[PDB]
Amino acid sequence: MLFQTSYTLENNGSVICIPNNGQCFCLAWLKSNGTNAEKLAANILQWITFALSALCLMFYGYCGWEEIYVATIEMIKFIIEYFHEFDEPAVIYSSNGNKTVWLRYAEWLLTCPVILIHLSNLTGLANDYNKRTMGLLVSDIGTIVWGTTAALSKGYVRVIFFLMGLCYGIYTFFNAAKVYIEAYHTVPKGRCRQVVTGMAWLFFVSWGMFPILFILGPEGFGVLSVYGSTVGHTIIDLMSKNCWGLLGHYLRVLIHEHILIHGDIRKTTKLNTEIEVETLVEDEAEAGAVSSED
């Protein structure tokens, strides 16, 4: 540690004395991060993630910028974890006694908006983004900022900022859901609709797990230890980023093959909220005005 770890209790445990060496001191910081079993598990999941993220980068290496940016950051993340995981400021040890994993929240700020940009162009064919895309990004940034602030805070201050994060988060989840519904009815009828369905399940489950891990972790009720929280977070990271990004590359190849073999043939379908989506079709026998009541 690069904070003070050696001290003496004096006067029946009522006074703590430390070397006057300029280092900060706090008992709360010295609480254990967890068991050796938790530590072993965390280093394994990290290695798996560093390696798999590096494989994904090379694999994608065989437009497309979103999968690479996230996979690059994940890799960079491990080297910092690997060398300085518990060094400030990968973990912030603050005057109120909290341990805040800035690396995680910073990583979310780097990667989550890019995932949402990817989500807004699942097929990869669009060159533009609507107004709703922008709201998705702004709501998600706020979620992380409130969540980070909550983690840095204590008591009632933590609770309030968490709840604003929850309000921002619901708005994010709701609009993400809207995007996936449009995407499902946009992509061709076969395999493309299977992949999109898989991504929705992956997305809502993995992203939905995050507020739960927060509540359980040191940032909340301290059920999970620091290592415990790391293991959980790396799991849902693999889901939310690596696996989801894999599917996204796969989905985009499938969309590309469809347009190469069949061309870009569109049919307008309307979904009655009442939304309209231009579905990709396979042959020119369809170019009509189809609908679908929900």
Ligand X SMILES: CCCCCCCC/C=C\CCCCCCCC(=O)OC[C@H](O)CO
- Residue 86 DSSP label: T
What is d(CA 73, CA 292) in angstroms, rounded to the nearest whole number?
A: 41
| Binds a copy of itself by CB under 8 A, chosen from 75, 125, 145, 216 | 145
- State how far the Cα of 270 lies from the Cα of 277, in Å rounded to an integer: 6
In whole angstroms, the minimum distance from the beta carbon of 16 to a copy of itself comes to 5
Cis-peptide into 89, omega within 30 deg: yes
Asked whether position 36 contacts a copy of itself by CB under 8 A, the answer is no
- For residues 25 and 171, which CB has a smaller minimum distance to ligand RET in the complex? 171
Look at strands 265-271 and 99-100 and give their pairing: unpaired
Residues 6 or more apart in contact with residue 226 via CB below 8 angstroms: 33, 34, 91, 99, 101, 217, 218
Measure the CA–CA gap between 163 and 146, rounded to whole angstroms.
8
The interface partner of residue 220, options being a copy of itself, ligand RET, ligand X, none and the CB cut-off 5 to 8 Å by kind, is ligand X
List residues binding a copy of itself (CB under 8 A): 2-3, 9-10, 13-20, 22-29, 69, 88-89, 92-97, 102, 106, 109-110, 113-114, 117, 127-131, 133-134, 137-138, 141-142, 144-145, 148-149, 152-153
Binding site for ligand X (CB under 6 A): 2, 37, 65, 69, 72, 75-76, 80, 84, 87, 89-90, 103, 106, 131, 135, 138-139, 149, 153, 155, 157-159, 162, 164, 166-171, 173, 208, 211-212, 215, 220-221
